[PDB]
Amino acid sequence: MDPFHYDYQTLRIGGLVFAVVLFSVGILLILS
């Protein structure tokens, strides 16, 4: 409600999940 607090540590979790997904997809692709 207040435009002075952004919900970090939730963006960080999403970014790390996305990076892990990309890394796993690349590793699986090299193994195909």
Binding site: R12, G15, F18, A19, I30
Partner: protein, 960 residues
């Protein structure tokens, strides 16, 4: 050390029987004791010395010391500089090691890919076995054109000349004799030195020393890349020093200035270009060697992509070299051999003694066996050791005769001269089978027209007939008829030595010929059809479309050479020679205009009297050339004369006498299954199989290397502009710095250096063999078009994408682009803690720095996003991605991994205190998507324009 004394005591010392040799059981018994016959290799590095050589060695120990000093300085109170230095050295060294420990491993495989063989005689049998396990006792055999396996004490020589060229270095071939000549082991004649090639003749010796206890046991592309790297590094150092001084003038506490200098230097130079080039060459060498195409040096890989002429012989290369007899000719009757087991057809009469004389001339000149133990195996499919024409004649005779070895043992030969290409005659003196007339037989073998002039008599239906002028015309007509079918024939004849003129005890001399070899009779000749290889016509077509001029330098008659050329495709349809044109027009060949014929057949005899200008004009004014009945010295003649007009000529050779031609030619191609060791070691390229389609495949690989290298270099160079432009605008326009040094390292030492390897695995384009060969002189790896396309068309769009992202973040946080100009002085001032933004708010220093570092991070992310499309468009430089496909998975792996690294660096907690990288909102990942799409669309359109109209302005000024 045993040449002084006789052979009986040397042979008993090593427990050897001179006639037989060593038993099989004793071979391993002595091998396991003494060990292998090979010189001890120099000691190998423990595989961690080179690691530290590349990390802590060279010009990197200074950077390591600086990083340690910066870390210490941070500890007592700075950290950024230490992290930057440590990252630079660690990543650069590790990458340079990974590409050096791979190329070395691949090149280690070529030592044992082709084996070294020696001809040992053990237990009364000669076998071609690897020369590593040569024991110090067995009896070995050496033949002209081979290299000795170990030190040999000659026991039975046959005029064998051994050229050392390794101790003395003199290329003069020294003859070898079984008798002692000098007490000095270094210049005696009994001893043959180790690792010395045998030029001519054949000698048998007993090995006295193996392994260490022996006499011997006591690229342009890289240069061009290095020059370009040195030039760009000079420019980078100049710019970096200038801007470092300027930053000090502006005032940046001597440590932000060093960071600026490091950022500029890292951004302006490609840090992994040379290792990438080396690994590209090595990977393509392995790919070439996987197919039957082996290269000795890495320079032959750089060449062979600019090949414009192939001078390949006929037999073995353009034909399978497994000849089955088809036709005969005797008594003016063209007979054909029916090879059926049941003897069907009965087209030929066997009872005539002309055929028994034919077997008695063509049955004992051959040196052919069947390894003794063959039962139930048909004579047609029985394996033979020897030549092809030899033992092809035996497959012919054995269907009629019934004794593989009995009849050959019935007589015995007293004279023997090995068949040689230059001498061309095969002679042997045999005792007659007749018990009342035991005369001495004489035999002939070679070119039918070269032997016909040696005969003034000819058998006809049973009895000799005098020299007939019509007989010569009949022989020529029969030769034409048999050669028109793409067949090679052998003309041979026999003569009985007079009984009273030559007493029946005379020794048959070898050097000084005393037997009459000028007035013999003539039995006949037979055909030996050799069909061409299956994949050869396709290879000749591929060469024709690729602008490679194929020249056949054969060694037999012009008619059969022309026939096999026409069958293969060397002489294309609709193209005619001057003699065929004259025959069509019934015109004398003298007055036929030579400009109406583009194919020519050159006889070898006429080639000896042709001058350099005549050879040059013959090569220049013809496109389909064959050289019939030539010798390897003449092969040197064509090889030398064909590169005088800017050609990269690759020639094939297998004999001992072909070595100067192979050395003179740009690419010397030896033979892996039929070539002598001299040619195999004097060449830059070995055909694991003699196919001539493997030559074209190797040429295709050599062409592909250049395309892949150009693509990788262009992709690596593209990302230099967006990493140097932000610093340019940071001082020219006075805006907050949009790119830090760690970010520059991530752009350069990250998404640029490492994914460039993935472009080396790209498949060959559709038109790879449909364009003219590259010019080694006027065409370079790095040219103005590549620099233009990298630094002015793609780099600028990438920089625009990064700057758009930077402006988006700065505007969304308050600082509109209007009042960003000229704010650099107050922005970077630590004493100003109330800087006013566009909306009127006031920021502390560490509150503006967070926004600036987020801008840096999203600049990095936008560079990654645009380099997605930059890597996609660099897959092809002539075709389109939609018609090329995403075949290689290494490229997609690189894309996913660079994006994963980008998304991990920003979002990982605790990375905003070490690398100064901050998380960016999800909306900011799509800032550079329009510019990536623009890059893709622009290159697709440009390549479509290039394909539509070749040779236009786009190709002239943009086709890198």
């Amino acid at each position: 050390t045993e040449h002084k004394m006789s052979v009986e005591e040397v042979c008993r010392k090593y427990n050897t029987d001179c006639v037989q040799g060593l038993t099989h059981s004793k071979a391993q018994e002595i091998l396991a004791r003494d060990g292998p016959n090979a010189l001890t290799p120099p000691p190998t590095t423990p595989e961690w010395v080179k690691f530290c050589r590349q990390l802590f060695g060279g010009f990197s120990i200074l950077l390591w010391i600086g990083a340690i000093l910066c870390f210490l300085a941070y500890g007592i109170q700075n950290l950024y500089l230490g992290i930057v230095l440590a990252a630079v050295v660690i990543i650069t060294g590790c990458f340079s090691y990974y590409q050096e420990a791979k190329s070395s491993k691949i090149m280690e495989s070529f030592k044992n890919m082709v084996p070294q063989q020696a001809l040992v005689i053990r237990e009364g049998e000669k076998m071609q076995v690897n020369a590593e396990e040569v024991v110090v006792g067995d009896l070995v055999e050496i033949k002209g054109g081979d290299r000795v396996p170990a030190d040999l004490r000659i026991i039975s020589a046959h005029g064998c000349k051994v050229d050392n060229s390794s101790l003395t270095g003199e290329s003069e071939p020294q003859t070898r004799s079984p008798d002692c000549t000098h007490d000095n082991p270094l210049e005696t004649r009994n001893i043959t030195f180790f690792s010395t090639n045998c030029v001519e003749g054949t000698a048998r010796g007993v090995v006295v020393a193996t392994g260490d206890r022996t006499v011997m046991g006591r690229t342009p592309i890289a240069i061009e890349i290095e020059h370009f790297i040195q030039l760009i590094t000079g420019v980078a150092v100049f710019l970096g020093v200038s801007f470092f001084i300027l930053s000090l003038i502006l005032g940046y506490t001597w440590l932000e200035a060093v960071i600026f200098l490091i950022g500029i230097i890292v951004a302006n130079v490609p840090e992994g270009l040379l290792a990438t080039v080396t690994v590209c060459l090595t990977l393509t060498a392995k790919r070439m060697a996987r197919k039957n195409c082996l290269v000795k040096n890495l320079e032959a890989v750089e060449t062979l992509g600019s090949t414009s002429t192939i001078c390949s012989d006929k037999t073995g290369t353009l034909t399978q070299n497994r000849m089955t007899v088809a036709h005969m000719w005797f008594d003016n009757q063209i007979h054909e051999a029916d090879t059926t087991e049941d003897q069907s057809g009965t087209s030929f009469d066997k009872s005539s003694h002309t055929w028994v004389a034919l077997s008695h001339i063509a049955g004992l000149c051959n040196r052919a066996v069947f390894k003794g133990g063959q039962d139930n195996i048909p004579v047609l499919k029985r394996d033979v050791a020897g030549d092809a024409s030899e033992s092809a004649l035996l497959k012919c005779i054995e269907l009629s005769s019934g004794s593989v070895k009995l009849m050959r043992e019935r007589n015995k030969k007293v004279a023997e001269i090995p068949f040689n290409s230059t001498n061309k005659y095969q002679l042997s003196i045999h005792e007659t089978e007749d018990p009342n007339d035991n005369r001495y037989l004489l035999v002939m073998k070679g070119a039918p027209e070269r032997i016909l002039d040696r005969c003034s008599t000819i058998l006809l239906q049973g009895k000799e007939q005098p020299l007939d002028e019509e007989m010569k015309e009949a022989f020529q007509n029969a030769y034409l008829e048999l050669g028109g079918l793409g067949e090679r024939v052998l003309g041979f004849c026999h003569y009985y030595l007079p009984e009273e003129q030559f007493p029946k005890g005379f020794a048959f001399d070898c050097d000084d010929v005393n037997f009459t070899t000028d007035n013999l009779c003539f039995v006949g000749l037979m055909s030996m059809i050799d069909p061409p290889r299956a994949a050869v016509p396709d290879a000749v077509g591929k060469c024709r479309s690729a602008g490679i001029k194929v020249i056949m330098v054969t060694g037999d008659h012009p008619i059969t050479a022309k026939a096999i050329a026409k069958g293969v495709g060397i002489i294309s349809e609709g193209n005619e020679t001057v003699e065929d044109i004259a025959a069509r027009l019934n015109i004398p060949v003298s007055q036929v205009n030579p400009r109406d014929a583009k194919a020519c057949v050159i006889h070898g005899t006429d080639l000896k009297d042709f001058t350099s200008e005549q050879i040059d004009e013959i090569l220049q004014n013809h496109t389909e050339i064959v050289f019939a009945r030539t010798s390897p010295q003449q092969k040197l003649i064509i090889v030398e004369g064909c590169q005088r007009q800017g050609a990269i000529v690759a020639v094939t050779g297998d004999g001992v006498n072909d070595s100067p031609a192979l050395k003179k030619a740009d690419i010397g191609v030896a033979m892996g299954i039929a070539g002598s060791d001299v040619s195999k070691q004097a060449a830059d390229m070995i055909l694991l199989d003699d196919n001539f389609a493997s030559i074209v495949t190797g040429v295709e690989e050599g062409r592909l290397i250049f395309d892949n290298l150009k693509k990788s270099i262009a992709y690596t160079l593209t990302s230099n502009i967006p990493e140097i432009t932000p610093f340019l605008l940071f001082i020219m326009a006075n805006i907050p710095l949009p790119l830090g040094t760690i970010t520059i390292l991530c752009i350069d030492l990250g998404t640029d250096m490492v994914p460039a390897i993935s472009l080396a695995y790209e498949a060959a384009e559709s038109d790879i063999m449909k364009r003219q060969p590259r010019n080694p002189r006027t065409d370079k790896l790095v040219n103005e078009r590549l620099i233009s396309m990298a630094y002015g068309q793609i780099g600028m769009i990438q920089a625009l994408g990064g700057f758009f992202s930077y402006f988006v973040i700065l505007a969304e946080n308050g600082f509109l682009p209007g009042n960003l100009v000229g704010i650099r002085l107050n922005w970077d001032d630590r004493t100003v803690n109330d800087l006013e933004d566009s909306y009127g708010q006031q920021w502390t220093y560490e509150q503006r720095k967070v926004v600036e570092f987020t801008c840096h991070t999203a600049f990095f992310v936008s560079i990654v996003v645009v380099q997605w499309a930059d890597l996609i468009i660099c897959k092809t430089r002539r075709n389109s991605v939609f018609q090329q496909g995403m075949k290689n998975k290494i490229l997609i792996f690189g894309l996913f991994e660079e994006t994963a690294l980008a998304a991990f660096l920003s979002y990982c907690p605790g990375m905003d205190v070490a690398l100064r990288m901050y998380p960016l909102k999800p909306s900011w990942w799509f800032c550079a998507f329009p510019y990536s799409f623009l890059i893709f669309v622009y290159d697709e359109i440009r390549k479509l324009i290039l394909r539509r109209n070749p040779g236009g302005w786009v190709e002239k000024e943009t086709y890198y």
